[PDB]
């Protein structure tokens, strides 16, 4: 039934769909090249693999999209499992379900697993829940072997917890990804102008001009925003003054609920 | 413009255990290490100036402070709850004693006049305590040297040697070896540094950490002359170089 | 179920393996021994062959190790719950077993029970937070003192036990529902003396031996420490290939207790004198 | 917890913690013969490097006929003495006679409930021993607590198992029990109640009163380390 | 008996670690096998001396430091039974799953005569004593006491004496550790090991590879924060660089940045923000 | 605990770590250096609407004919600090007969912040500061403050959300020439180094209005206006 | 959540949401503007009627603080009037001093820290009002607006109430059309347009207008309300802009 998680993999999809900050995109791919295509190298040195990794990027920047693309590169089963989604008042229901998670997981390798919003993870109640945080970290590299099954924690609250990050030999590649510049903002329109008509000119100069703080989701929503009332023109191309009639208010909801983004 | 928080900020426990000071004495430990040792020839103190950035001076920051010409002091824990306390002691040594018996006081009578405000920070209303426990050195022609540790509750230990902070107990586990009675001062810096070398992870240079001592009469500091009677400032601080001259000499 | 029941395989202990403990047997056997040894004798007066008793005291004692030997030299049975096993993750399983419990001993008058721990059935309070466990402490006490318990108290004495005393329900105790209690304290020094005589029976025509010269020194609470130091004393001899043993090799074994006798670090807080 | 108000059935929330809290503190006893007075206290710590030699902490004096002992905070008691000291010599510039105690405590401890009574301020984490003399009621002995109620006695303890320790004086004390016949009870009263039966002259502190000087004068004698160190042998410890 | 909550671990499916994968640690590794590996064999001597076999241990120290590395090379060299467990399975969502199983746990051992078990961690279980505030927590302590009587309540010798792994060893609910219940307790430090850092820093280098154009045992000289689990974690990362550039074996300039590439975050306003 | 200035359960002050973050409401970065016999100070000047009078907008104040200061915080919180400065200069010289230094006057207002952490009638201030002055006894100098009381000089420094973007960039510089302050005399010919460093290190290009400037000239402090900046910007004509 | 209950309790976000709730109180009020003309300032405001029983032209909402000033507000009627009664004595205690009228920067420097003082303490109510003022000094023209967090900036124009979104973009549509300089009389026309143009958020109800300006030219830079045909000249005009 966790099929509901682990059933978004089969259709092959390109790793090209996001440019982003390429050097990080060069990082996680090259380090995960190794088990699949060139595992000879670990043998010629005789060094253990990367026992799973994590990352950080603030919200709504293709993080799950990034993860959801990699499993289609090679044929894993990309799961979807919110941290808070697995949260129940029942004590063992926390620590029982996780054990059944790895269970079906190791029942099917070479595959892949994912988490995002784990940042939530002397008083009476709290003295039991740290054990969950003390359990699973043990279940990474406590006693058992792990062949071809890995994990990412991809949060938006990087003040998560000292001990999981206190000894970064358990996990590694504790990477970051910040938000775009024009350097990033510009090329992102190329994929987002891919399957749509347009006039043809260096129109994206307004892109570097403004949008200094948006992310990828809304600019994508800004694209379709322009196309809606661009049909009043109804032309067989699209103009960059079109979008300008809505770039304001999208920022005014991007204005709404101002939240900060530090990296750690 | 209206005051209504005049209640106490303080709370009894079932079994004593006054709350919001027992929490205070975490930060005193979270702060840096610092120490103090005596001997009949003289007295010493020291700390470690943890310069945060590579930008800040250490000249501007007084992790060691002068109280009178014959006293020093030092802390660990928090700073702004230390800077204020100096001046509220300096203004007291005069406004109770020094303008009233002429001579500056012995060391402990001063200490009665810091706990007598430190206490008021708690039993009064609308306030918190100073998150600090600091140290004093001693001198007087009628009772001699001494150290005197204080603490935010209002107590004050005496000592022959001690230390505090993020490396305290290890030192207290150490110095009970190093201390003895047959002591001059020129020896006391080796052990004091040699102590404070082991409890550090960063740089260990003379321009990084300040300390100071209790020497003997030094009329060159006094500014004027002609009166052979006067006793000059026994207190004194060291420079950048004279630290390193010891360090090379190990 | 009869797994809880008594045994055709009794343990092999004895109440003369138990040095230092000298007076308590005289103070507690009789309620378990005498009027059941002679009900006509007791019935000459017949005051009340009371209900069970209780023992309180720290660990380090062998209250257990006492209770293992009493099941030898009995004339009666000695059942065991393997404490707190009676409860399950349900409701109805509670009272039936207790109903099954008494009757299992009604058929055996000269026969008794054992608890070790009643820290888990103590101090019932409820405003929505609580548990079914509180339900079962009643019915046992109900069938302890009711129309059908005194016939057991005609047939039965019992005992409870724990290591922490005042953390339970006083509404439990109607003194008479439990007619006597006792302390198992930590030992005296000289009480400790005859202990190591028991367990170190391994010297080999050796000499220069001063068994008194160890409770000379101790300020502990346990008697089991006499074994903890003894048992690892021989480990030294075990590693160094010489079976023999002496005082000093046996003495620094307290160095293991150099932690225990000194693990309790101390605070410097002179807030109040 | 709103120091003023009572329980739902006629009790207080705080102050019963306080005189129960002070039980954590050290020991301070105090007795009397018909000849002289003895006092004692065991310092909370007796580590070796620090200045236990001149450590005058548990036992202070007030004037040249009185001595006390202390139990509670180092500080919240440290102010009362500076207070009450003034109320002694400020008795004198009015009247020029010596001070009696029976005015002092009755005119002192009423300050205590003054902070239970109002202001929302906590009471004083302190209890005392008293000692002294007037020419009208002879030798004397008194005590106190954070409430204010004071009680005259012939011999008393405080602190750790004082209820237990007060037993130890119960059988042995004598009406005409002289000083050197009564002094040994004190440290023997402590030689049992101690945590560290390993005992050090350093760990405790001592004081005396007599009428040693002829012409009816007295002595606020206080005893130094090596003296009581040798006194300790007299009852035969080592 | 099936008792399908923990199976016989290591019949043919086992890890593959060695004793010698460790560096030193013989200051503790000696004593443990001085009460584990030998009682397999020289039981007669324990009958010649020692009224019982000294056994029962509580291994502790800070976690992520070296404890669980040692737990299981022995598993490679038992010639006997062995069991693992997640050290908080006992916190079941409902009640009773433990007390129904823990009594069936040692039921697995007594039939599997002789054996051994272990535990992940018990930081949640250490609880000296509470006043009964709610059943939400009291299902903990009842398990702990039941564990104890299950250990040396009645069954004395034929059982196996066991371990206690943790992340701290001061919260431990006392009356558990005893001269009879355990008779042993050990740990290992964290401060600088000039004797051990000098060899453990390259004991794995035998497992690793290196082509020295110079000497690379010099970061060991740089003693500030000698730890125990990083000191192999670094080269667990540093080796990923020559490969990142097709270099076939690393150089000593490749790793010194790899040392600091693990940035030590000595500067963080999260430390500066709190007190001041 | 999470509403007032008592000591935390563990022993930090949750009401104070907030206040540092109460500054970062604006996405603004400023900078501080030391000249040869002068100094410099600058910050962004955002204007996301058309109708303002940027004649009026300012964070950089004027307290004497000697000194100055800056702010990265809510300006209402700033002005109460701004006013209390002008006062606390006067009462000094009126009592001693000479102008107000910086090292002292921070040591006053640093004492002041403490008794906003030691009582509870008061709201603290979600700002920080970088005072600037020459000194006839100490020379070009600056001093920074937090809302707690930690105040320290800096040979050169900056502040805003983006300290990491530049503060590394500066430490890289002094590890390239290795002296405290610059080896260039005129203030006019060193502000270029500042604006050369912002846009290059991690900053974004600027225009005429986008920035504002202060200089603690010998016996003179004062701001700058449009062409006074545009000219100084066209120093980039050569580089 | 639990931090949003009283003054002077910052957030993890670094704020006190309580004043940010005040912004919705002042959001629940009438429209009001004031424009920086070429030589002075202008004032105009919305004043809605509930019943006919309300008299016209006896219930002004402008307030004067001294000769060379006009001030208005929107939202809480009393609270925006209190600080005027503080204003009316402050500058009076400043003309007391060097015997000269008061500047406008003197005004906010003597007000904009006041309301701040009503956000330091756990014992008072932040002034839930947004506020305007203007006038003339020796230097020339000025204009300012206030927000309840103490802030204020020199504008060319402002707006409050639920007449925000109309006027702001409209003034964006004005200024580029006329940046050269707008004298006093002419803005008195174009101002009253906007209020008729901005009532459409609340065109369920009715009102009547109220205007005031002050010119260095016309009225010797004194304050002088409107009462005459000039008003009637503008309403006859402003209907055409909405016509
Ligand atoms: N006098 C004694 N005679 C025999 N054994 C003793 C004696 N004193 C201590 N012991 C030892 O003490 C151990 C058990 O005592 P302890 O009270 O510490 O735990 P326990 O009684 O088993 O715990 P609980 O009562 O909570 O179940 C046994 O191993 C036993 O050998
Ligand atoms: N001597 C060593 N040889 C090999 N690996 C080591 C050594 N010391 C530490 N490590 C590595 O450090 C990592 C963390 O240490 P380890 O897990 O042993 O600490 P721990 O005390 O067992 O923590 P926990 O009990 O929570 O598992 C392990 O994965 C282990 O591989
Ligand atoms: N670096 C990027 N380049 C192009 N598009 C992006 C980038 N980051 C995010 N997007 C767009 O923003 C959206 C992010 O949505 P999603 O991945 O569901 O949330 P999250 O980013 O939290 O994982 C996607 O639709 C994607 O097209």
Distance CA D140, CA F237 (A): 97
**Could you tell me if B129 lies within 8 Å of chain F, comparing CB atoms?**
yes
| Neighbouring-strand partners of residue D70 | D128
Q: How many Cβ contacts (< 8 angstroms) between chains C and D?
A: 28
Q: Would you call the peptide bond into C95 cis, given omega within 30 degrees of 0 as the criterion?
A: no
Q: Which of C88, C83, C82 is nearest to C135 (CA)?
A: C88
In testing the pocket of ligand 1, which one of C25, C58, C61 has its CB within 8 Å of the most ligand atoms? C61
Element housing B71 (H / E): strand B71-74
Distance CA F193, CA F185 (A): 13
Q: Which residues neighbour D180 within 8 Å (Cβ) at sequence distance 6 or greater? A: none
The DSSP result for E91-124, as a single string, is: S-SSSSHHHHHHHHHHHHHHHS-S-----S--TT
The SS3 of residue G17 is helix
Distances, alpha carbon D93 to alpha carbons A98, B92, D90, in Å: 83, 28, 6
Question: What are the chain E neighbours of F146 within 8 Å (beta carbons)?
Answer: 276
Q: Of the candidates B55, B57, B127, which has its C-beta nearest F119's C-beta? A: B127
Q: Which of F156, F74, F144 is nearest to F102 (CA)?
A: F144
Distances, alpha carbon E188 to alpha carbons C259, E27, E185, in Å: 14, 8, 11
Annotated binding site of C for ATP: 57-64
| Neighbouring-strand partners of residue B44 | B37, B213
Distance CA E224, CA B199 (A): 10
Query: E263, E268, E275: best mutation site toward chain F, by most F Cβ within 10 Å?
Result: E275
Answer positive or negative: Cα dihedral of D49, D50, D55, D58: negative
The answer to whether the CB of G160 falls within 8 A of the CB of G26 is yes
Distances, alpha carbon C257 to alpha carbons A130, C240, G73, in Å: 33, 21, 81
Known binder of ligand: residue E207?
no
User: Could you tell me if residue C185 is left (phi over 0), alpha (psi between -120 and 50 degrees) or otherwise beta?
Assistant: beta
The DSSP result for C141-203, as a single string, is: HHHHSSTTTHHHHHH---B---S--SSS-GGG--TTTS--EEE--PPPHHHHHHHHHHH-TT-
Residues with CB under 6 A from ligand 2: A 138, 141-142; E 21-23, 63-69, 121, 165, 167, 200, 228-229, 232
For ligand 3, the distance from its centroid to the CA atom of residue A217, given in whole angstroms, is 5
Structure tokens at E61: 């120290």
Interface of F with A in 168-207 (CB under 8 A): 204
The DSSP result for G79-124, as a single string, is: HHHHHHHHHHHHTHHHHHHHSSPPPHHHHHHTTTTHHHHTTSSTTS
Distance CA E256, CA A15 (A): 33
Known binder of ligand: residue E180?
no
- CATH number for B1-249 (one of 3.40.50.970, 3.60.20.10, 3.20.20.70, 1.10.10.350): it is 3.60.20.10
The SS3 of residue B79 is coil
- Chain G: residue whose CA lies nearest to B5: G122
Q: Which residues neighbour A82 within 8 Å (Cβ) at sequence distance 6 or greater? A: A115, A116, A117
The answer to whether the CB of G37 falls within 8 A of the CB of G213 is yes
Known binder of ligand: residue E66?
yes
From the CA of E149, the nearest ligand is: 1
For ligand 1, the distance from its centroid to the CA atom of residue E211, given in whole angstroms, is 61
Q: Quick one: how far is CA A127 from the chain centroid?
A: 31
Query: Resolution of the deposited coordinates, in angstroms?
Result: 4.7
Distance CA E16, CA D233 (A): 68
Rounded to a whole number of angstroms, the distance from the CA of G12 to the nearest CA of chain F is 5
CB atoms near residue E205 (< 10 Å): 13
Distance CA D145, CA D126 (A): 6
For ligand 1, the distance from its centroid to the CA atom of residue E144, given in whole angstroms, is 17
Residue in the structure block whose two tokens are 């001993």: C105
The answer to whether the CB of F151 falls within 8 A of the CB of F129 is no
From the CA of C196, the nearest ligand is: 1
Distance CA D235, CA A73 (A): 91
Question: Which DSSP letter does residue E220 get?
Answer: G
Distances, alpha carbon E18 to alpha carbons A138, B236, C50, E22, E218, in Å: 20, 61, 62, 8, 28
What's the half-sphere exposure (Cβ side, CA atoms, 13 Å) at B243? 20
Helix, strand, coil shares of chain B, percent, nearest 5, are 35, 20, 50
Q: How many Cβ contacts (< 8 angstroms) between chains C and E?
A: 126
The SS3 of residue C88 is coil
How do beta strands A172-174 and A53-54 pair?
parallel
Structure tokens at A42: 């670990």
**Could you tell me if C129 lies within 8 Å of chain E, comparing CB atoms?**
yes
CB atoms near residue E229 (< 10 Å): 17
Answer positive or negative: Cα dihedral of G187, G188, G190, G191: positive
- Chain G: residue whose CA lies nearest to A248: G169
In testing the pocket of ligand 1, which one of C56, C64, C83, C118 has its CB within 8 Å of the most ligand atoms? C64
Distance CA E181, CA E176 (A): 7
Residues with CB under 6 A from ligand 1: C 17-21, 59-65, 116, 163, 195, 222-224, 227; E 149, 178, 180
Q: Quick one: how far is CA G69 from the chain centroid?
A: 12
Distance CA B47, CA B50 (A): 9
Structure tokens at E210: 């290196």
Distance CA F211, CA F205 (A): 11
**Could you tell me if C270 lies within 8 Å of chain D, comparing CB atoms?**
yes
Distance CA D44, CA D50 (A): 13
Q: Experimental method used, please?
A: cryo-EM
The answer to whether the CB of D152 falls within 8 A of the CB of D117 is no
In testing the pocket of ligand 3, which one of A66, A216, A223 has its CB within 8 Å of the most ligand atoms? A216
Contact E224 B201 (CB under 8 A): yes
Element housing C232 (H / E): helix C225-239
Q: Which residues neighbour B241 within 8 Å (Cβ) at sequence distance 6 or greater? A: B206
Known binder of ligand: residue E61?
yes
Q: What are phi and psi of G114, to 5 degrees?
A: -65, -60
How do beta strands B34-37 and B135-137 pair?
unpaired
The SS3 of residue B197 is helix
Q: What are the CB-based long-range contacts (under 8 Å, 24+) for E11-18?
A: E14/E75, E14/E76, E15/A143, E15/A144, E15/A145, E15/E72, E15/E75, E15/E76, E16/E76, E17/E69, E17/E72, E17/E73, E17/E76, E18/E73, E18/E76
CB atoms near residue A39 (< 10 Å): 11
Contact C239 E34 (CB under 8 A): yes
Q: Say whether the D–F interface has 3 or more Cβ pairs within 8 Å.
A: no
Contact B5 G122 (CB under 8 A): yes
Q: Say whether the C–G interface has 3 or more Cβ pairs within 8 Å.
A: no
The answer to whether the CB of B111 falls within 8 A of the CB of B75 is no
Structure tokens at G218: 């016309």
Q: What are phi and psi of A205, to 5 degrees?
A: -65, -30
CB atoms near residue A153 (< 10 Å): 21
Distance CA C169, CA D116 (A): 36
The answer to whether the CB of G162 falls within 8 A of the CB of G31 is yes
Contact B2 G117 (CB under 8 A): no
Contact E64 A142 (CB under 8 A): no
């Amino acid at each position: 039934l966790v099929y509901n998680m682990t059933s978004f993999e089969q259709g092959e999809i390109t790793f090209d769909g996001i440019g982003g900050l390429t050097e990080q995109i060069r990082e996680l791919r090259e380090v995960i090249e190794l088990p699949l295509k060139n595992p000879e190298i670990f043998q010629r040195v005789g060094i253990k693999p990367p026992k799973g990794v994590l990352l950080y990027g603030p919200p709504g920047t293709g993080k799950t999209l990034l993860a959801k693309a990699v499993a289609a590169t090679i044929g894993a089963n990309f799961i979807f499992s919110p941290a808070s989604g697995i949260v129940d008042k029942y004590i063992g229901e926390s620590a029982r379900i996780i054990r059944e998670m790895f269970a079906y997981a190791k029942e099917h390798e070479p595959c892949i697993i994912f988490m995002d919003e784990v940042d939530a993870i002397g008083t009476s109640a709290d003295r039991e829940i740290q054990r969950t945080l003390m359990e699973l970290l043990t279940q990474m590299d406590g006693f058992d072997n792990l062949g071809q099954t890995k994990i990412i924690m991809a949060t938006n609250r990087p003040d998560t917890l000292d001990p999981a990050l206190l000894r970064p030999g358990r996990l590694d590649r504790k990477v970051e990804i910040p938000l775009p510049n024009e350097a990033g903002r510009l090329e992102i329109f190329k994929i987002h102008t891919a399957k749509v008509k347009k006039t043809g000119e260096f129109d994206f100069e307004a892109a570097v001009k403004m949008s200094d703080g948006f992310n990828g989701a809304d600019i994508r929503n800004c694209a379709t925003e322009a196309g809606f009332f661009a049909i009043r023109d109804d032309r067989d191309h699209i103009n960059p003054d079109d979008l300008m009639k809505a770039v304001r208010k999208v920022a005014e909801v991007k204005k709404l609920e101002g939240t900060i983004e530090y990296q750690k | 413009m209206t005051d209504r928080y005049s209640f106490s900020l303080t709370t009894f426990s079932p079994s004593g255990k006054l709350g919001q000071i027992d929490y205070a004495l975490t930060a005193v430990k979270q702060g840096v290490t610092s120490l103090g040792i005596k001997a009949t020839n003289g007295v010493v103190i020291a700390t470690e100036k943890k310069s945060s950035s590579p930008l800040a001076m250490s000249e501007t920051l007084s992790k060691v402070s002068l109280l009178t010409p014959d006293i020093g002091a030092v802390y660990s824990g928090m700073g702004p709850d230390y800077r204020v306390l100096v001046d509220k002691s300096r203004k007291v040594a005069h406004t109770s004693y020094k303008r009233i018996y002429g001579e500056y006081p012995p060391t402990k009578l001063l200490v009665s006049e810091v706990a007598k405000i430190m206490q008021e920070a708690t039993q009064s209303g609308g306030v918190r305590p100073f998150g600090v426990s600091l140290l004093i050195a001693g001198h007087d022609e009628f009772n001699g040297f001494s150290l005197y540790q204080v603490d935010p509750s209002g107590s004050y230990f005496p000592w022959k040697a001690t230390a505090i902070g993020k490396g305290s107990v290890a030192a207290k586990t150490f110095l009970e070896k190093r201390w003895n009675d047959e002591l001059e001062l020129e020896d006391a810096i080796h052990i004091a540094l040699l102590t404070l070398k082991e409890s550090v992870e960063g740089e260990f240079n003379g321009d990084t950490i300040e300390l100071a001592i209790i020497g003997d009469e030094n009329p060159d500091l006094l500014g004027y002359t002609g009166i052979p009677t006067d006793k000059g400032p026994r207190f004194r601080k060291l420079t950048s170089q004279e630290i390193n001259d010891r360090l090379e000499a190990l | 179920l009869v797994s809880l029941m008594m045994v055709e395989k009794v343990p092999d202990s004895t109440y003369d393996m138990v040095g230092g403990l000298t007076k308590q047997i005289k103070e507690i056997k009789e309620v378990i021994e005498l009027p059941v040894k002679h009900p006509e004798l007791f019935e000459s007066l017949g005051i009340a062959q009371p209900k069970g008793v209780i023992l309180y005291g720290p660990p380090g004692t062998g209250k257990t190790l006492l209770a293992r030997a009493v099941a030898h030299h009995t004339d009666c049975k000695f059942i065991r719950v393997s404490g707190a096993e009676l409860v399950q993750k349900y409701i109805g399983e509670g009272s039936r077993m207790v109903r099954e419990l008494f009757v299992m001993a009604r058929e055996h008058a000269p026969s008794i029970i054992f608890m070790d721990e009643i820290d888990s059935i103590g101090s019932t309070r409820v405003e929505g937070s609580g548990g079914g466990d509180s339900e079962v402490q009643r019915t046992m006490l109900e069938l302890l003192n009711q129309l059908d318990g005194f016939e057991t108290s005609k047939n039965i004495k019992i005992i409870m036990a724990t290591n922490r005393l005042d953390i339970l329900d006083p509404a439990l105790l109607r003194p008479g529902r439990i007619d006597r209690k006792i302390e198992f304290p930590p030992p005296s020094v000289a009480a400790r003396a005859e202990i190591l005589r028991i367990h170190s029976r391994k010297m080999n025509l050796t000499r220069g031996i001063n068994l008194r010269k160890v409770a000379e020194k101790m300020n502990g609470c346990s008697g089991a420490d006499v074994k903890g130091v003894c048992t690892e004393a021989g480990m030294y001899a075990l590693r160094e290939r010489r079976i023999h043993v002496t005082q000093e090799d046996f003495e620094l074994a307290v160095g293991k207790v150099m932690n225990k006798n000194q693990e309790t670090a101390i605070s410097v807080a002179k807030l109040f004198k | 917890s709103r120091t003023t108000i009572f329980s739902p059935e006629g009790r207080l929330y705080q102050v019963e913690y306080a005189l129960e809290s002070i039980s954590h503190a050290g020991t301070a006893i105090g007795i009397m013969a018909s000849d002289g007075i003895v006092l004692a206290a065991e310092r909370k710590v007796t580590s070796t490097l620090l200045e236990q030699d001149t450590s005058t902490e548990k036992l202070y004096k007030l004037n040249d006929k009185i001595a006390v002992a202390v139990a509670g905070l180092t500080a919240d008691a440290e102010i009362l003495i500076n207070t009450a000291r003034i109320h002694a010599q400020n008795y004198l510039k009015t009247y020029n006679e010596d001070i009696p105690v029976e005015i002092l405590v009755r005119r002192l401890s009423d300050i205590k409930q003054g902070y239970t009574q109002h202001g929302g301020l906590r009471p004083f984490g302190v209890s005392f021993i008293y000692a002294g003399y007037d020419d009208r009621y002879g030798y004397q002995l008194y005590t106190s607590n954070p409430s204010g109620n004071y009680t005259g006695w012939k011999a008393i303890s405080v602190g750790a198992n004082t209820s237990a320790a007060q037993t130890l004086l119960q059988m042995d004390y004598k009406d005409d029990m002289k000083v050197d016949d009564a002094i040994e009870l004190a440290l023997k009263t402590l030689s049992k109640t101690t945590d560290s039966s390993a005992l050090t002259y350093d760990r405790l502190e001592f004081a005396t009163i007599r009428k040693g000087a002829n012409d009816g004068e007295v002595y606020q004698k206080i005893f130094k380390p090596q003296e009581i160190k040798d006194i300790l042998v007299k009852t035969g410890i080592t | 008996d099936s008792d399908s909550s923990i199976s016989v671990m290591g019949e043919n499916e086992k890890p593959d670690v060695t004793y010698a994968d460790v560096g030193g640690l013989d200051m503790q590794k000696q004593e443990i096998r001085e009460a584990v590996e030998l009682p397999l064999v020289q039981a007669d001597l324990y009958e010649q001396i020692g009224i019982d076999p000294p056994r029962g241990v509580l291994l502790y120290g800070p976690p992520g430091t070296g404890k669980t590395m040692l737990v299981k090379a022995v598993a490679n060299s038992t010639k006997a039974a062995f069991i693992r467990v997640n050290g908080s399975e006992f916190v079941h969502k409902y009640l009773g799953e433990g007390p129904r199983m823990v009594r069936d746990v040692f039921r697995l051992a007594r039939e599997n005569a002789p054996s051994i078990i272990f535990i992940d961690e018990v930081d949640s279980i250490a609880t000296k004593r509470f006043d009964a505030q709610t059943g939400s927590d009291r299902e903990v302590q009842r398990i702990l006491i039941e564990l104890l009587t299950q250990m040396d309540g009645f069954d004395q010798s034929t059982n196996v004496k066991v371990i206690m792994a943790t992340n701290r060893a001061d919260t431990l609910d006392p009356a558990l550790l005893r001269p009879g219940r355990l008779d042993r307790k050990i740990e290992f430090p964290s401060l600088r090991d000039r004797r051990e850092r000098r060899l453990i820093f390259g004991t794995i280098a035998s497992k690793m590879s290196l082509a020295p154009e110079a000497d690379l045992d010099s970061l060991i000289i740089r003693n500030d924060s000698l730890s125990g689990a990083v000191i192999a974690a670094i080269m667990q990362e540093a080796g990923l660089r020559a490969v990142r550039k097709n270099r076939y074996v690393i150089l000593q300039s490749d790793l010194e940045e790899a040392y600091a590439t693990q940035v030590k975050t000595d500067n963080t306003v999260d430390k500066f923000d709190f007190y001041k | 605990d999470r509403h007032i200035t008592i000591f935390s359960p563990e022993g930090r002050l949750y009401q104070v770590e907030y206040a540092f973050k109460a500054t970062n409401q604006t996405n603004i970065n400023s900078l501080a250096v030391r000249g040869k016999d002068c100094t410099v100070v600058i910050s962004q000047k955002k204007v996301p609407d058309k109708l303002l009078d940027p004649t009026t907008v300012s964070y950089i104040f004027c307290i004497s004919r000697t000194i100055g200061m800056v702010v990265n915080g809510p300006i209402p919180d700033a002005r109460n600090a701004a006013l209390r400065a002008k006062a606390e200069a006067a009462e000094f010289r009126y009592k001693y007969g000479y102008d107000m230094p910086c090292d002292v006057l921070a040591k006053r207002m640093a004492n002041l912040s403490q008794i906003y952490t030691q009582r509870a009638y008061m709201r603290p201030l979600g700002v920080i500061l970088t005072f600037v002055s020459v000194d006839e006894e100490l020379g070009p100098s600056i001093y920074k403050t937090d809302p707690a009381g930690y105040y320290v000089g800096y040979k050169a420094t900056a502040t805003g959300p983006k300290q990491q973007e530049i503060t590394t960039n500066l430490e890289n510089h002094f590890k390239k020439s290795k002296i405290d302050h610059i080896n260039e005399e005129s203030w006019e010919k060193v502000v270029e180094f500042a604006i050369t460093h912002m846009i290059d290190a991690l900053g974004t290009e600027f225009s005429k209005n986008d920035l504002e400037v202060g200089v603690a000239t010998k016996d003179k402090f004062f701001t700058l206006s449009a062409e006074n900046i545009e000219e100084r910007l066209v120093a980039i004509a050569e580089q | 959540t639990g931090y949003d209950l009283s003054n002077s309790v910052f957030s993890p976000d670094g704020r006190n949401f309580q004043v940010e709730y005040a912004v919705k109180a002042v959001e629940n009020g009438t429209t009001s503007i004031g424009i920086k003309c070429n030589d002075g300032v202008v004032f105009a405001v919305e004043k809605l009627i509930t019943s006919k029983l309300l008299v016209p032209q006896k219930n002004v909402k402008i307030q004067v603080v001294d000769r060379h000033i006009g001030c208005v507000y929107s939202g809480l009627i009393p609270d925006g009037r209190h600080l005027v009664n503080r204003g009316r004595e402050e500058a009076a205690s400043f003309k007391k001093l060097y015997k000269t009228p008061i500047p406008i920067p003197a005004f906010a420097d003597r007000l904009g820290q006041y309301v701040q003082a009503h956000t330091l303490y756990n014992s008072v109510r932040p002034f839930g009002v947004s506020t305007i003022f203007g006038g003339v000094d020796k230097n020339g023209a000025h204009l300012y607006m206030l927000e309840p967090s103490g802030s204020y900036w020199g504008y060319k124009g402002a707006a409050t109430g639920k007449g925000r979104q109309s006027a702001k973009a409209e003034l964006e549509k004005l200024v580029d059309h006329h940046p050269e300089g707008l004298s006093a009389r002419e803005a008195v026309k174009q101002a009253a347009k906007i209020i008729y143009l901005a009532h459409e958020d609340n065109k369920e109800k009715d009102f009547e207008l109220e205007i005031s300006w002050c010119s260095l030219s016309e009225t010797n830079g004194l304050h002088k309300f409107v009462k005459g045909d000039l008003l009637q000249e503008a309403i006859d005009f402003a209907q055409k802009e909405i016509n």
